[PDB]
Amino acid sequence: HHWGYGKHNGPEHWHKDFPIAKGERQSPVDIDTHTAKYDPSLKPLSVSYDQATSLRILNNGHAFNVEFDDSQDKAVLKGGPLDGTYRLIQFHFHWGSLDGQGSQHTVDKKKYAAELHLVHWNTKYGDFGKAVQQPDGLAVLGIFLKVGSAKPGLQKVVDVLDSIKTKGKSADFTNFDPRGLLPESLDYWTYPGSLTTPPLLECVTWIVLKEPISVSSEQVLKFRKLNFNGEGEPEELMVDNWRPAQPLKNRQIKASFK
Ligand SMILES: [Zn+2]
Ligand SMILES: [Zn+2]
C-alpha cells in the first residue's frame, strides 16, 4: 500500500511504485575509505547559519522535520563540491531500534546509531519543487550520531518530541540554531546521489561529514518513542526508518581530506 519501513511496505518494495529505486545514482551507499579519492580541488565547505530562522517541527509519519524559513538567503551552504548557493529548508534524522544500526550511510561497513540530514536546495531553481527535478538541485549534509556523551544543542529537539508523537502533529519551534549540531571538523566525503526515501529522485549532491557527533543513550531513546501512525491508530514505534546501502555503480566517492 503506501511506503514505509514495515515488512509489507519497506525498502524492498519501493521499486514497484518508484522504479527509480533501481536507478544508477541511488543512496545511501557504503563509504569505502580506502577507495575514496582525495581530491585537493575540492573547496572547504561554507556553512552560514547565523541568520537561520526555524519555524516548526512536524511528525510526517516517517521522521520528524524541523523546518526553516527559506524565503530568503538566511541559512545557506556553499563551497565544497557546490556551484551556487543552497538554502536550508529542513533537517531530520534516520535512527535505529538499537544502537548498532540507524544511519543511512556506512563507513567501511560500520553503521552508526543515527544519521542527521540537513536538506538544502539550489537557489538558481527558485523553489524546492523545481530543485528536486534537477541533477544538482539539492545538497544534503549527512552527520553521523554515535551514542556516548549527551549533545546539549540537541536537547531542545528531544524535549518537544512528546508534543508531535503521532503522524501529522506539529508544534511551533522558533529560535533553534542548527549550529549546535555540527561536529568540530567539516572534513567530508562527497558523491552524486539521491533522496533516501520515496520519491528517491536523483537530485542530491551528498556531503557526508567524517566526524560523528555524540548523543546520549537517553537522547536517542526519545527518538524511539515517536509513532509512525496517526493518533487513535494502533501504535507503531518510529524506529529503523533507514534504507539499505545501494550499489555504487558508475560513481566515485571523493574525500576533502587525506
Ligand atoms: Zn533523510
Ligand atoms: Zn532530479
UniProtKB/Swiss-Prot annotation:
Its cofactor is Zn(2+); Co(2+). Changing T196 to A/C/H/P: Strongly reduced activity. Changing P199A: Normal CO(2) hydrase activity, but impaired stability. Keywords: Acetylation, Cell membrane, Cytoplasm, Disease variant, Lyase, Membrane, Metal-binding, Osteopetrosis, Phosphoprotein, Zinc. Changing V119 to K/R: Strongly reduced CO(2) hydrase and p-nitrophenyl acetate esterase activities. Zinc. Can also use cobalt(II) with lower efficiency, but not copper(II), nickel(II) and manganese(II). Activated by X-ray, histamine, L-adrenaline, L- and D-phenylalanine, L- and D-histidine, L-His-OMe and beta-Ala-His (carnosine). Zn(2+) binds at H92, H94, H117. Changing N60L: Reduced activity. It is linked to Osteopetrosis, autosomal recessive 3: A rare genetic disease characterized by abnormally dense bone, due to defective resorption of immature bone. Osteopetrosis occurs in two forms: a severe autosomal recessive form occurring in utero, infancy, or childhood, and a benign autosomal dominant form occurring in adolescence or adulthood. Recessive osteopetrosis commonly manifests in early infancy with macrocephaly, feeding difficulties, evolving blindness and deafness, bone marrow failure, severe anemia, and hepatosplenomegaly. This is Carbonic anhydrase 2.
